[PDB]
């Protein structure tokens, strides 16, 4: 009866911080005075503190639709792609997609990209956030963007990649036109966005292709990092539910109402927009 919510570590949408020895969460406010609402999350066995854009949205959806929840972090740490089961013609999803389809989760509340591949199997909400794909590099690295020669004609001297088992991994694997770029990326893809972002700072990864809502926040907080400033593909984040879930209709209505409410504008100002 308590909805099992799965999510993933991805600032500024989901922060994950240790709990106090009390087992409760440090009380904070934003620099503008608004309370930072925190929920207990379980993840890799240990209770932790989770907050951010999507946590604020989850609390709004729960209060609006009058349901209770318990939040856990995805066990394998991935967003979700569909893979072949070895020695089999079966296919299965990993990441949060697999947890939602198997029943370990009743709802995905995370920056989960809406695409055709996932929409075949699950139901997406109307987008709660519109954004796209961009490229993050270290300050001093100079590329024009997705069409830079060092990306269209890759080599081991300039390493670029994305996150494994993600929507970006899907997007480059499926397009005939990205066959050369995908061959380079699949040798260097990272297990999580945080590891990839740290590799860009440490000059072990030269370009990171990822979500603009995340990369632009990272550049606004870490002066050694910059983006192309260009979106080469536009996409949206949606709440993920199983087919014919009883909450599908009202979740989408609440998201549309929240956009028109200015509530999403408040979340955007609080979590997303910076200098």
């Amino acid at each position: 009866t308590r909805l099992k919510i799965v999510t993933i570590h991805q600032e500024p949408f989901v922060y994950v911080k240790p709990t106090m020895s009390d087992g409760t969460c440090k009380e904070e406010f934003t620099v503008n005075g608004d309370p930072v609402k925190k929920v207990i999350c379980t993840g890799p066995t240990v209770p932790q503190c989770c907050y951010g854009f999507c946590i604020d949205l989850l609390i709004k959806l729960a209060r609006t639709m009058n349901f209770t929840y318990e939040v856990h972090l995805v066990a394998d740490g991935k967003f979700g792609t569909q893979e072949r089961v070895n020695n089999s013609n079966k296919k299965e999803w990993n990441g949060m997609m697999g947890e939602l389809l198997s029943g370990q989760a009743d709802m995905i509340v995370a920056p989960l990209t809406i695409n055709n591949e996932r929409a075949q199997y699950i139901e997406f909400s109307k987008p709660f956030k519109y954004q796209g794909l961009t490229i993050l590099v270290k300050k001093g690295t100079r590329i024009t963007g997705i069409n830079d020669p060092r990306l269209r004609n890759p080599s081991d001297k300039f390493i670029y990649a994305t996150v494994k088992q993600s929507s970006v991994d899907i997007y480059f694997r499926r397009q005939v036109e990205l066959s050369t770029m995908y061959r380079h990326m699949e040798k260097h893809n990272y297990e999580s966005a945080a590891e990839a972002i740290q590799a860009v700072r440490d000059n072990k990864l030269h370009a990171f292709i990822w979500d603009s809502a995340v990369l632009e926040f990272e550049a606004s907080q870490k002066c050694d990092l910059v983006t192309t400033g260009e979106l080469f593909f536009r996409s949206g984040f949606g709440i993920g539910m199983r087919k014919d879930s009883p909450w599908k209709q009202n979740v989408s209505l609440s998201i549309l109402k929240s956009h028109e409410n200015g509530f999403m504008e408040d979340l955007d100002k609080t979590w997303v927009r910076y200098q």
């Binding site: 055709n116 987008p127 979106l231 536009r234 949206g236 028109e260 200015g262 999403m264 504008e265």
Partner: protein, 278 residues
Amino acid sequence: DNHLSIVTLEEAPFVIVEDIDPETCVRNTVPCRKFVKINNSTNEGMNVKKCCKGFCIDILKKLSRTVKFTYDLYLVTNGKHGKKVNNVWNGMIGEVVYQRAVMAVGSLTINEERSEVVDFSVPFVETGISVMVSRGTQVTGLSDKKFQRPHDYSPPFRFGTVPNGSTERNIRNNYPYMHQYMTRFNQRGVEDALVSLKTGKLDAFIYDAAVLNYKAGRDEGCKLVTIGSGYIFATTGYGIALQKGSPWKRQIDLALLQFVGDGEMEELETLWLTGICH
């Protein structure tokens, strides 16, 4: 039955309406019928054959081929996109609600009020409430304090919208003083507002993001600019409206997401929407 009645609405470049070639519809267009009244004191009229083309018409052609359906397209004549007058819908939404059409194709914005009475596709182009200004003017978006508290600045910003639409209703609900102030700068239409901007009679024009982006892209001299997409207020999109619980929704949704993912949607935007201005 996979033959569907579909309603549309003229709004370039999304739906452009032409006459028949003096007698078929020339290529790149599809037939669309329009009920034309004899006069304003009668319901009598004549069905006239027209030809329809544009961004959303190219969407409909792709959908008809992929989802495998035929259609009779007709233009709405009572209302525009969809407005609830005394709890009775007009426009394209009314055609779907009262089951004269099973599908609405056009510059139709997805919102909460309409989604309670129709089912919406996934959005196929992003839109919302945006702001257009002359190049050099500094505003952040609808939530800018220069709009919320206009008299905190001297001289106050001169800004308005086209009333009686979705934009005015949203501002009235969200920013009551901004609505009270900006009615003095009500614009009769988009073309009127563009001229007021370019002639210095208006400082900003608040309207649909998709329309403003299209207008700024083709502005002569590229003098008119819109805010960045990250500052659009109440981000939503144009979507296909279907009857509540329609069996076509799932395959229409998967078709549109396929068009977006495989570059077909970007090609239509290049063909119809992107302009020369930066």
